[PDB]
RNA sequence: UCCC
């Protein structure tokens, strides 16, 4: 399918299904590269207290509940592992993810 | 323990899991915290992946690894602190900067 | 119909 950055996908991890936030750059996403790097998203809002983590409301993400991006949990998944494209994270919130991403990875 | 950035470990990477070298790219503050997990980039012996943009070739002389290796910037894994015990060595500041630009490139940072 |  068409996978691009800043988009939220329901990923298959009986696999344990979880929403993920693609953080890999779009040129690699469009390539023949088999895998996609993403951040694991939880509905546990308590994790938004962690420094790098950002909060995502359900109203913008089309997720069934208010969720939190866990920038400390980074997974590299096959493109085939991604399922539903539920929504896209707006620029303002993705920028907060990028800042938190730089703190965790010292970038 | 005191797992630091730019350091290389042996890890049982889950796909039979694979025993591969990994380069710790998680910052030292988070490494020092009570966070149970550490983020790292997979190191490969397949030196053909060096041609890939963000990837950085690792000379065997500098990494204390058995053979010439390449850090796979597109291969990022989250591991527990307790699973990073087999320590090899640390990637010098000169090569780690190339890993920085590669990580910014792949992750669009 | 989708969180020690």
Swiss-Prot record, chain A:
Molecular function terms, GO-annotated: DNA binding; RNA endonuclease activity; RNA nuclease activity
UniProt xrefs under InterPro entries: PemK-like (IPR003477), Plasmid_toxin/cell-grow_inhib (IPR011067)
Give a Gene Ontology cellular component term annotated to this protein: extracellular region
Task: Recite the UniProt keywords alphabetically.
Answer: Endonuclease, Hydrolase, Nuclease, Secreted, Toxin-antitoxin system
Record's subcellular location: Secreted
> What do mutants without this gene show?
Individual deletion of mazF3, mazF6 and mazF9 have little to no phenotype, but a triple mutant shows increased sensitivity to oxidative and antibiotic stress and starvation, decreased formation of persisters cells, and a decreased bacterial load and pathogenic damage in infected guinea pigs.
Could you say which EC number(s) this protein's record lists?
Answer: 3.1.27.-
What do we know about what induces or represses this protein's expression?
Strongly induced (17 to 25-fold) by nitrosative stress, starvation, when grown in a non-replicating state, in the presence of gentamycin or rifampicin.
Q: Which GO terms describe its biological process?
A: mRNA catabolic process; negative regulation of growth; positive regulation of growth; rRNA catabolic process; symbiont-mediated perturbation of host process
One Pfam match: PemK_toxin
Q: What top-level branch of life does the organism fall under?
A: Bacteria
Question: From the record, what ranges are coiled-coil?
Answer: none
Output the Gene3D superfamilies linked to this UniProt entry: 2.30.30.110
Complexes and interactors: Forms a complex with cognate toxin MazE6, which neutralizes the toxin. Interacts physically with non-cognate antitoxins VapB27 and VapB40 which neutralize the toxin.
| Function of the molecule | Toxic component of a type II toxin-antitoxin (TA) system. Upon expression in E.coli and in M.smegmatis partially inhibits cell growth and colony formation; its toxic effect is neutralized by coexpression with cognate antitoxin MazE6. Acts as an mRNA interferase on ssRNA, cleaving between the second and third bases in the sequences CUCCU and UUCCU.
Q: Which family does it belong to?
A: Belongs to the PemK/MazF family.
Full protein name: Endoribonuclease MazF6
UniProt organism field: Mycobacterium tuberculosis (strain ATCC 25618 / H37Rv)
Top-level taxonomy: Bacteria, Bacillati, Actinomycetota, Actinomycetes, Mycobacteriales
Gene name, per UniProt, is: mazF6
